[PDB]
């Protein structure tokens, strides 16, 4: 019940993700990912120095869209805050398997690494 996703992230997030083998929760409260994993989907707006990392998460932790991206449901996601209020089990950030750096943003253009 696993799905491959891609995320443009900074060095610090990548390091944390690698050290824990767990998806880092965005400081916005909801971590967004490309689904299906696509290096160009959100590369345009990714800043210089960002890395495009692909990894595998459980399907049950994704909420997909028709627009090529998905939410990862963590404690501070809207779904997570609902669960807290209703007295349901609050979902934790999922594991990240097969972590692979597939690209970098260099000089304003999407490099493939």
């Amino acid at each position: 019940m696993t799905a491959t996703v891609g995320r443009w992230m900074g060095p610090a997030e990548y390091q944390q993700m690698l050290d824990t083998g767990t998806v880092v929760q965005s400081s916005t409260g909801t971590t967004h990912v490309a689904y299906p994993a696509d290096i160009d989907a959100f590369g345009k707006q990714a800043k210089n120095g960002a890395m495009y990392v692909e990894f595998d998460v459980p399907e049950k932790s994704l909420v997909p869209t028709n627009e090529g991206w998905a939410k990862i449901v963590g404690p501070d996601s809207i779904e997570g805050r609902l669960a807290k209020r209703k007295g349901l089990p609050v979902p934790e950030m999922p594991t990240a398997e097969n972590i692979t750096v597939r690209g970098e943003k260099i000089n304003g253009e999407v490099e493939a690494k």
Partner: protein
């Protein structure tokens, strides 16, 4: 965009602005929660924003839209929808 939005919110509104600072991105989030709605408006420095309003009773989203804009006027009209969506 973020700084004039911060000022706009401060001037026209009581909502609390949270600033997130990361090595590559600035962003702003506005959390609001009451009896009927759990809601959040997120705006990024990359000219995009996210509008989330969850109805507590049903557990289904009232508003759940991702927007890319290119103008401060466009941002305000989007935020206006989010505001109207609460009260």
């Amino acid at each position: 965009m973020l700084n004039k939005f911060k000022l706009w919110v401060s001037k026209h509104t009581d909502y609390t602005v949270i600033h997130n600072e990361n090595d590559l991105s600035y962003s702003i989030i506005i959390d609001f929660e009451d009896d009927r709605y759990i809601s959040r408006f997120t705006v990024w420095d990359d000219l995009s924003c996210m509008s989330e309003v969850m109805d507590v009773d049903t557990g289904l989203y009232k508003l759940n839209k991702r927007n890319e804009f290119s103008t401060f006027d466009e941002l305000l009209d989007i935020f206006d929808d989010f505001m109207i969506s609460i009260k």
